[PDB]
């Protein structure tokens, strides 16, 4: 027992059943941590042992946060979230702060714990079941389910929202300039204060929360370099778009003109008046690729012109909050990665390029997962919604390591794609 509060009833989207997703393998390291976090969550009565009678399942794993060194249980509740989307989105959806994108610094607080103090609708509980695997299958799996709101379930923030609003009334009225947004297990706090004053107001929020039950993780601040902790804050201004750019060759062989045509062509679907006739004429007959076709003055007129159309964000792009968000990533090589976020095709809402953490270790997998987290974070900040990822990798390869680099409380939806480097619609030199 945790709260005299009456539980708000939740019902799966009609005609859909609960999750019956199988538990994947786990490294000793994670199991051990998972076992420990579960044993104690059991004592305090937040979860409950259960057996085969419960036909549902969701997988679990844990991540040792570089953030605070402390392990974090993670239940991949994407199925369940999908199966209960009317509840947390349409009915009790939490509003988004346009202004959050506009702060100079924005910190993220992991406030999952807040959830363990609210009973979960008694009927709905069977759906949050999970199993713990055992090295070399020494024993059968150990199963459990929640009684309190689970972390990572989109329902929790929705339900706990009244309590959260209350908890924040004080702090928010004595700081009408700070912005707070709750997205699942996190609190996005943004200010325009000097960084040092920001870093302070955060500790102050951390305090107010404590003086109310809510504990939030102790983030490390090492004294030896790299002072990674300096990244904790997000700065929604160094957040710029990456438009497409037409090259600039000295002399343009056939090859170049061709490529410049495919791309300029591709782009024609995004941007309005990209014209290519004039410039293709230069490639009017069965010519050899290496032939230095001299640029026409009639053509040049437009090459150096279309590019003027390519300097301004796709015009007429609206963000419908009622729709989904898709994101594509292209492995540009050299630790480079570019990405577009849209709802409809070719009507991108954002384009950018995640550079590369120096701790990339020449590991594409590690970098992609990091890119996916980065873009997800940007999405939440900017529109307050997670995109579905068309991931440039082989499903079975990504599934073998992504957790090893995951460091977030949420998990975005993703699918795999194998599209070659058709045209570098999205790249440079």
């Amino acid at each position, epitope marked *: 027992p945790i709260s005299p509060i009456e539980t708000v009833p939740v019902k799966l989207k009609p005609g859909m059943d609960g999750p019956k997703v199988k538990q994947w393998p786990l490294t000793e390291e994670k199991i051990k941590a998972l076992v420990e976090i579960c044993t104690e969550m059991e004592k305090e009565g937040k979860i409950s042992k259960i057996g085969p009678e419960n036909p549902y399942n969701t997988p679990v794993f844990a991540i040792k946060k570089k953030d605070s060194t402390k392990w974090r249980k993670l239940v991949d509740f994407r199925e369940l979230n999908k199966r209960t989307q009317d509840f947390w989105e349409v009915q009790l959806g939490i509003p988004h702060p346009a202004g959050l994108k506009k702060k100079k610094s924005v910190t993220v607080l992991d406030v999952g714990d807040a959830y363990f103090s609210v009973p979960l609708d008694e009927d709905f509980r069977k759906y949050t079941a999970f199993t713990i695997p055992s090295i070399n299958n020494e024993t059968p799996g150990i199963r459990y389910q929640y009684n309190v709101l689970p972390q990572g379930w989109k329902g929790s923030p929705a339900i706990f929202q009244s309590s959260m609003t209350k908890i924040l009334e004080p702090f928010k009225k004595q700081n009408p300039d700070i912005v707070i947004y709750q997205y699942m297990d996190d609190l996005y706090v943004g200010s325009d204060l000097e960084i040092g004053q920001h870093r302070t107001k955060i500790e102050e929020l951390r305090q107010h929360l404590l003086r109310w039950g809510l504990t939030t993780p102790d983030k490390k601040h090492q*004294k030896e370099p*790299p002072f990674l902790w*300096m990244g904790y804050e997000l700065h929604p201004d160094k957040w710029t778009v990456q438009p497409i750019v037409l090259p600039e060759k000295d002399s343009w062989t056939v090859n170049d003109i061709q490529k410049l045509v495919g791309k300029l062509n591709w782009a024609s679907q995004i941007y309005p008046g990209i014209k290519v006739r004039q410039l293709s004429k230069l490639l009017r007959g069965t010519k050899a690729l290496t032939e230095v076709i001299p640029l026409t003055e009639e053509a040049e007129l437009e090459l150096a012109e279309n590019r003027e159309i390519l300097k301004e964000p796709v015009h007429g792009v609206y963000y419908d909050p009622s729709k989904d968000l898709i994101a594509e990533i292209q492995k540009q090589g050299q630790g480079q990665w570019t990405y577009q976020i849209y709802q409809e095709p070719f009507k991108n809402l954002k384009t950018g390029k995640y550079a590369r953490m120096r701790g990339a270790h020449t590991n594409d997998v590690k970098q992609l997962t990091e890119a996916v987290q980065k873009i997800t974070t940007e999405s939440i900040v900017i529109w307050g919604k997670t995109p579905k990822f068309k991931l440039p990798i082989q499903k079975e390869t990504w599934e073998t390591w992504w957790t090893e680099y995951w460091q977030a409380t949420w998990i975005p939806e993703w699918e795999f794609v194998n599209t070659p480097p058709l045209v570098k619609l999205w790249y440079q030199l």
Partner: antibody
Framework: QITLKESGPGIVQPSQPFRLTCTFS??????????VTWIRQPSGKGLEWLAT???????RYNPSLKSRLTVSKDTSNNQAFLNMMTVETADTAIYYC???????????????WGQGTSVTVSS | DIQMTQTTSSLSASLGDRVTISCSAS??????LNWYQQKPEGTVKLLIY???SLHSGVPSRFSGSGSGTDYSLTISNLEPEDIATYYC?????????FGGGTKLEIKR
């Protein structure tokens, strides 16, 4: 507008302790990343790191001396202190305090120094 | 405990001259080395932070150069103040350590 000033006893009986005080203005030992460092420079010799007290009391001591050293602060008064137990003649040197500050993922230097205090160990 | 070494300790030069002082580490300190200037009086200032970044207010004729185990401070062209003792401090790992210092003098 940042300044630091060391103060102490200048002359100390051997085996006895001494307490140096760094009084600073222009910054706070509360602002994340900041910290005060104590440096030492024996008569004629070069610079020696003694200890660094951080804004989050996650202090660091020079191994050779952690045993007789204790760093501390009074944030409300912008003072930092360095206690040194059982001093010996070899402790006779100039002691500086310097505002030290972690600014980026890479930058961490002792930005401003004090003029020092001369501690002399002699019976 | 990363011992820092500046081999040349006493060095005579002349106004106008371009000088370079050596600071080598006991182990790759990944450009986490700083340069300190200590006038003959004794007041100590910061010249360069992070292998080669120019501390504010420092004359635009100072340059930090270096990497891995070896690093060099380079005084463009000597002025009379510059003739001082120079120090390199490493901050890759505590305990923080300083070179032995290189006293820059005047050729006569």
């Amino acid at each position: 507008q940042i300044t630091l000033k060391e103060s102490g006893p200048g002359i100390v009986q051997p085996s006895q302790p001494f307490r140096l005080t760094c009084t600073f203005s222009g910054f706070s030992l509360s602002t994340s990343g900041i910290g005060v460092t104590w440096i030492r420079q024996p008569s004629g010799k070069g610079l020696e790191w003694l200890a660094t007290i951080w804004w989050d009391d996650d202090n660091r001591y020079n191994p050779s001396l952690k045993s007789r050293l204790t760093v501390s602060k009074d944030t409300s008064n912008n003072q930092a202190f360095l206690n040194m137990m059982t001093v010996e003649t070899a402790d006779t040197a100039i002691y500086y305090c310097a505002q030290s500050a972690i600014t980026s993922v890479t930058d961490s230097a002792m930005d401003h120094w004090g003029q020092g205090t001369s501690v002399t160990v002699s019976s | 405990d990363i011992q820092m070494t500046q081999t040349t300790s006493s060095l005579s030069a002349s106004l106008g001259d371009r000088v370079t002082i050596s600071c080598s580490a006991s182990q790759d300190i990944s450009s986490y080395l700083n340069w300190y200037q200590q006038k003959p009086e004794g007041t100590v200032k910061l010249l360069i932070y992070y292998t080669s970044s120019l501390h504010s207010g420092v004359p635009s004729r100072f340059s930090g150069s270096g990497s891995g185990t070896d690093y060099s401070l380079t005084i463009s062209n000597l002025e009379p103040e510059d003739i001082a003792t120079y120090y390199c401090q490493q901050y890759s790992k505590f305990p923080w350590t300083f070179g032995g210092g290189t006293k820059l003098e005047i050729k006569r």
